[PDB]
Every structure is written in structure tokens, then in C-alpha cells.
């Protein structure tokens with residue numbers, strides 16, 4: 185029995201940028217008021233976790249990263265009403281406090297209690313529940329899922345179907361929901377439209393799934409790695425193009441292919457140049473372009489505002505625009521009801537102890553999602 | 559008496575950038591097939607016309623500028639079906655061909671036959687109807703309203719109510735429609751929202767009118783010329799701010815005043831820095847910013863795409879997003895029914911011969927719209 189007690193468990197600690205994770209024992213404090221301690225069952229490797237390693241994303245180190253996961257509630261703090269010990273849960277890297285101006289807005293999801301904008305790497309109360317070799321370790325996005333056990337604020341956890349397969353539905357914690365919502369909710373892709381998707385990783389494939397679900401007639405996948413094209417076509421891409429095969433800039437190729445510009449474009453990579461290319465390739469009068477990728481910290485892009493004056497719309501979103509705690513349980517229910525598939529995103533299933541091997545598969549281009557199992 | 563004949567008349571010819579207009583005789587050819595020759599009655603001075611003088615806006619010179627106007631059809635070429643001699647008309651600087659993919663789209667208005675994106679300074683057929691001193695003179699946006707007579711393509715003219723007061727409704731040909739539509743159609747301002755309007759000239763006042771019509775609860779006018787504030791409050795601003803009064807950047811001031819960002823912001827000036835400031839000041843998760851001002855030719859802005867990733871929407875539009883030929887007669891009918899006011903925009907009236915005085919008024923900061931009478 186662990187409730188009310190410090191847990192000693194295994195976690196993947198990142199002590200400094202550009203080094204492997206260290207798999208070692210940590211101490212996990214019991215949950216305080218309005219906090220939930222979760223035994224992890226499965227976590228995905230998202231490129232955003234790799235951004236912490238590479239320094240593309242700046243967050244306080246040392247840290248327990250991981251934000252795409254599912255597990256089972258081990259214990260609850262005083263005052264928790266929304267989950268109970270034994271419940272299957274997905275941690276929410278975008279919280280839903282329910283009280284801020286964003287949470288009350290019909291179309292906002294980027295709750296003001298988030299730890300993304302200006303990361304502290306703590307619990308809501310400004311402290312950490314993790315120690316390692318006598319040192320305090322930072323949280324990541326209020327989730328920290330690269331651990332056998334984590335502690336999250338109640339506003340950062342959702343209860344899901346007790347019959348959920350956690351090794352699949354962990355992807356609803358980030359990559360599936362982000363891509364699918366970016367198409368269906370943020371862009372609001374229309375029936376019969378032409379879409380261009382830049383980046384055919386886990387998130388870009390989920391964008392394709394959403395564009396197909398919304399009835400797009402043409403879905404053009406764009407990637408510099410042609411090994412990504414077969415799976416993109418399997419989930420709905422009608423064409424794939426590699427910019428490296430062309431003498432012309434790819435915005436010009438895509439404008440020609442679409443007879444004057446695409447209806448909807450998506451940047452799902454994290455590069456400044458592809459964000460401007462993706463905007464430019466949407467039709468100048470009525471096109472919509474959605475930024476999904478995360479680029480290098482503190483870098484500005486350059487663009488000509490005439491691209492917007494003609495009528496284009498440029499937007500971005502976190503987590504597909506979904507209000508996280510309302511949406512995650514519904515997405516799992518929809519998966520259980522066979523409304524979408526997750527298997528196409530899962531290329532590799534490894535034990536947690538092989539986290540570093542899982543990151544190497546991502547960095548080499550081999551994998552889409554590796555699921556780590558505890 | 560003039561049908562089929564060259565008309566000699568006075569026009570304001572711009573021979574060189576950064577020089578006064580030259581009021582002098584020009585020859586105006588009769589209309590060819592699907593062309594309309596108009597006797598001008600009234601034309602407004604829009605800041606975009608001044609951009610041609612300043613070189614902010616690049617169009618071939620020498621040119622007859624002017625794009626905000628109203629007149630009476632003198633004659634029609636072969637095959638014209640939509641207007642007749644003696645009809646009151648407004649030239650359409652954004653055409654509506656009715657046949658291209660943008661004209662067919664429910665939300666497009668930037669018709670592919672426009673002469674704004676890559677100006678040629680011609681009729682649709684690539685030729686000019688104007689001669690001066692024996693030399694061909696460019697058209698501007700297919701309209702060229704700074705002339706006693708002009709010739710336009712049929713897709714660039716709308717028939718309006720025969721009882722229209724042309725000295726007022728000329729403003730529907732650019733500044734009113736642009737500002738009003740930018741609020742009501744492009745931004746889709748909501749009841750009870752907070753808006754910020756950068757630039758309180760004729761277009762920005764028209765944006766305020768639209769925000770007030772849409773039911774905004776707060777409309778914050780922003781201008782470095784505090785002389786503009788009284789009229790902004792008359793048409794609906796709840797408060798005005800001058801950036802020069804503050805130690806902190808105005809995006810910070812507006813975020814504070816709106817308890818975390820505005821719902822809707824509008825750039826109605828034409829500066830790269832205020833386009834980025836206006837984006838920044840809208841709420842990071844659900845705010846919308848609309849670019850209305852014309853940027854300086856070929857210059858790029860610099861911005862951090864994290865402004866969009868959180869959830870902001872950035873867009874621009876020409877002519878308030880209105881499909882021009884469908885919309886202009888309806889806007890005139892609504893003016894006739896007192897659904898909106900134009901007199902607040904009109905600060906000065908001059909004869910056409912005093913065009914240069916009218917530009918001096920705009921450049922000094924004194925005027926909103928000067929209306930020139932032929």
C-alpha cells in the first residue's frame with residue numbers, strides 16, 4: 185500500500201540538454217489537496233519531448249519530461265472530485281481549470297493555468313513532487329509522464345473509459361487529438377476541399393485523418409522523407425510531394441497543383457520557413473493555414489503581410505483547439521466506438537527502459553509513434 | 559452627343575512620385591466591348607491614393623489615380639448588360655467577374671481579375687483609354703476616378719439607386735465599406751466584445767462604426783494624433799489611447815486595459831510594427847486581428863509564431879471582404895434607409911480643381927475624408 189507515502193520508483197530524468205535520459209530511482213511525494221498521483225501504463229514519444237532534449241523548447245532542467253500518456257490513479261489528495269483510485273486517466277498537458285476567461289470562452293482552450301508559455305516546471309502550487317539523488321526535479325507541462333508514477337493537479341487529468349486500451353489511447357493525450365482537432369476544429373476543413381499537410385509524422389498523419397474525416401477531396405502530404413509517404417496515403421493522403429525533388433519552391437508547386445492555391449494548409453514540422461511556405465500555398469483570397477509545429481525558442485519569422493491583406497487566414501493552436509478535460513473522455517469514447525483508428529500511428533512498442541532507443545528511432549526518421557510500456 | 563467619340567476633359571495626372579497632381583487636359587477613348595464610360599460626380603481622397611504619390615504603393619506611372627467615387631454612365635460599349643447611360647454608378651476597385659474561383663467561393667472577394675496584386679495600370683485588355691500630351695497614361699485599379707470621365711470594365715462598375723446622393727455614397731466605393739466590412743464580415747465582431755482599432759482615419763472610423771453596429775461593449779481607439787479622438791468617440795469609441803503617452807509598448811497597455819487581451823483588433827494604418835502590435839494585443843488563445851492598412855511595398859515584417867500557436871487568428875482583407883458588385887448597391891440601399899451614417903467621415907468638401915489642397919489636408923492630419931466635386 186502506497187497511499188499517503190513517498191513512492192520510490194523508476195523515472196527517466198533529463199539532467200542537461202543534448203544528453204540521453206537517465207533511467208533511475210526517484211522519490212514521488214504523495215498528492216496534496218486537489219492533486220492526483222498516477223501509476224503510468226503507457227507513454228508515447230512526441231517530437232515535443234525531443235525538443236526539450238535538443239533545446240528547441242526551453243524548460244527548467246533537470247526535468248521529468250513526457251506528456252502523451254495514460255495510466256491508473258493510485259491516490260487522490262483532499263478535495264479531488266473528478267477521479268478516484270483505480271480510474272483510468274489521461275494527463276492533460278493543457279489544463280482545463282474551468283474558471284479562467286479562456287476556459288469560459290466557447291472557442292478557447294489554452295487555459296491560463298498552463299505551464300507552456302512561461303514554464304516554471306512545477307505543480308500549480310509552485311513546488312515539485314519529485315526528487316532524485318537528493319535534488320528537486322522539475323515537472324514538465326504539469327504532466328511528467330516519463331516516470332512509473334507522477335503527480336498532477338486535478339485540472340490536468342481526465343477520467344476515461346474503464347475498458348480503455350491504455351497502450352493505444354495514450355495518443356489522445358497529444359498527437360492524435362492535436363492533429364485531428366487541428367483539421368476538424370481549428371481549420372474546420374470543408375467537404376470537397378483541397379488540403380496540404382507539411383510533415384507526415386504522428387501529428388501530421390492525424391491531421392490527414394481529420395481532413396479525410398471532414399470530407400476533403402484532395403489531401404497533399406509534404407515531407408522531405410519519402411519513407412513517410414506510404415503510411416500518409418494509407419490514412420488518406422491522395423498525393424505526396426518531396427520538396428527536394430523540385431527545382432521550384434514547393435509553395436509554387438502546390439499553388440500550381442491546386443489550380444491557384446489550397447483551401448487549407450497545415451504546418452506540422454516546426455520550422456519558420458515551412459510556416460511561411462504553408463501560408464503562401466493557401467489560396468490568397470480565402471485560404472486558411474494552421475501552424476501546429478513548434479519552432480526553435482525565441483526565433484522570429486519574416487513574411488510579407490500582403491499574404492494576409494488579400495484574404496488569407498493564419499492561425500495556430502495547442503492540442504487541436506480541444507478543451508482538454510471536456511474533450512479527452514469523449515475522444516476515448518469515440519475511439520471505443522470505432523470512429524477513428526490509432527494503430528496507423530504506432531510503429532514501435534518498447535518497454536519504458538528503452539526510452540533512449542525510442543528517441544533514436546524518432547530522430548533517425550524510422551518511427552511515427554513509439555509507445556513505451558511500464 | 560459624345561457616344562463613340564473621344565472626350566477631352568480635365569484629369570489629375572501624376573507624372574512623378576512625391577509631386578503634386580497636374581490638373582490638365584486628357585483624351586478619354588470611347589468604351590470598347592464590355593466597357594463603360596462614366597462622367598464622374600464625386601470622388602474621395604483615400605490614403606491609398608496618397609500611397610501612390612509617396613511610393614508606399616507601387617503602380618506604373620504616369621497614372622490617373624482615384625478609386626473612391628461615384629458618377630453617371632455617359633456611354634456603354636458593345637455587350638454591356640448591367641448598366642445603361644444615365645445610371646448612377648460606383649466604380650469597383652476590386653472587380654467582381656462572377657466567374658473565377660474566388661467570385662464563386664462563398665467567402666472570397668479578391669477576384670482574380672484585380673489589378674492590385676501585380677499592377678499593370680491598364681484595362682482588362684492590357685491597354686489604356688487615356689492620353690495626355692500625346693502620351694499614354696496608366697489606369698489605377700481599373701478605376702482612375704481623378705478624371706471628369708473615366709472608362710472601366712463592366713466587372714468594375716455597379717449600378718446604384720437613381721436617387722443616391724453621389725457626394726456621400728462615393729465613400730461606399732472604398733473607405734466606409736472597407737472599415738465597416740472588416741468589422742462585421744471579416745472579423746465578425748460579437749456582441750459584448752472588446753475591440754481595439756489602430757488608426758482613426760476614415761477607414762478606422764468605419765471600423766468603429768461596424769464594431770458598434772455588431773454590439774461591441776468596448777471599442778478602444780488608438781492613434782498618435784489625439785485630434786482624432788473626439789470624432790472616434792462620436793461614432794462609438796468608448797476610450798482612446800495615444801501610444802506616445804505611455805512608457806510601455808501599447809500592446810502591453812491594451813492587454814492590461816482588457817484584463818488579458820482584446821477579442822478583436824484592427825490595424826488601420828499601414829505600418830509593419832502596428833500590424834505586429836495589433837496581433838499581440840488580442841487575447842492569446844481566442845483573439846482575432848485583422849490587417850486593413852496597406853503595408854509599404856516589398857517590406858517584410860518580423861514576428862514570433864508563438865503568437866499564433868497559442869490560438870490567435872490573423873487575417874487581412876481588401877474592401878471589407880465584400881463581393882463588390884453584389885454588395886455596393888445593397889450598401890447604398892441601406893444608406894438610403896439610414897442604416898449607417900456617412901457624414902461623420904466627411905470633414906471637407908472641395909472642387910476637383912483643388913485636389914492638391916485636399917491631399918495637403920490629409921497629409922497635415924486635419925481631414926478625415928475630403929470629397930472632391932467635378
Ligand SMILES: NC(=O)c1ccc[n+]([C@@H]2O[C@H](COP(=O)([O-])OP(=O)([O-])OC[C@H]3O[C@@H](n4cnc5c(N)[nH+]cnc54)[C@H](O)[C@@H]3O)[C@@H](O)[C@H]2O)c1
Nearest residue numbers: 231232362383385386387407408409453454477478502503
Ligand atoms: N501544437 C501542438 O499542440 C503540438 C502537439 C504535438 C506536436 N507539436 C509539434 O508538431 C511537430 C510535429 O510533431 P511530430 O509529428 O511528433 O514530429 P515528427 O514525427 O518528427 O514529424 C515531423 C515530420 O516533418 C518532416 N520534416 C522535417 N523537415 C521537413 C521539411 N523541411 N519539409 C517537410 N517535412 C519536413 C519529417 O521528415 C517528419 O516526418 C513538432 O514540432 C511538435 O513539437 C505540436
Ligand SMILES: NC(=O)c1ccc[n+]([C@@H]2O[C@H](COP(=O)([O-])OP(=O)([O-])OC[C@H]3O[C@@H](n4cnc5c(N)[nH+]cnc54)[C@H](O)[C@@H]3O)[C@@H](O)[C@H]2O)c1
Nearest residue numbers: 605606736757759760761781782783827828851852876877
Ligand atoms: N484593405 C483595404 O481594402 C483598404 C481600403 C482603404 C484603405 N486602406 C488602407 O488603410 C489605411 C488607413 O487609410 P485611411 O483611414 O484613409 O488613412 P488615414 O486617414 O491616413 O488614417 C490613418 C491614421 O493612422 C494614424 N497613425 C499613423 N501612425 C500611427 C501609429 N504609429 N500609431 C497609431 N496611429 C497612427 C494617423 O494619425 C491617422 O489618423 C491606409 O494604409 C490605407 O492605404 C486599405
Ligand SMILES: OCc1c(F)c(F)c(F)c(F)c1F
Nearest residue numbers: 230232241251300358478502
Ligand atoms: O506536443 C505538445 C507541446 C506543444 F504543442 C508545445 F507548444 C509545447 F511547448 C510542448 F512542450 C509540448 F509538449
Ligand SMILES: OCc1c(F)c(F)c(F)c(F)c1F
Nearest residue numbers: 604606615625674732852876
Ligand atoms: O484603399 C484601397 C486600396 C487597397 F486596399 C490596396 F491594397 C491597394 F493596393 C490600393 F491601391 C488601394 F487603393
Ligand SMILES: [Zn+2]
Nearest residue numbers: 281284287295
Ligand atoms: Zn482555465
Ligand SMILES: [Zn+2]
Nearest residue numbers: 230232358359
Ligand atoms: Zn506532444
Ligand SMILES: [Zn+2]
Nearest residue numbers: 655658661669
Ligand atoms: Zn472573379
Ligand SMILES: [Zn+2]
Nearest residue numbers: 604606732733
Ligand atoms: Zn481606398
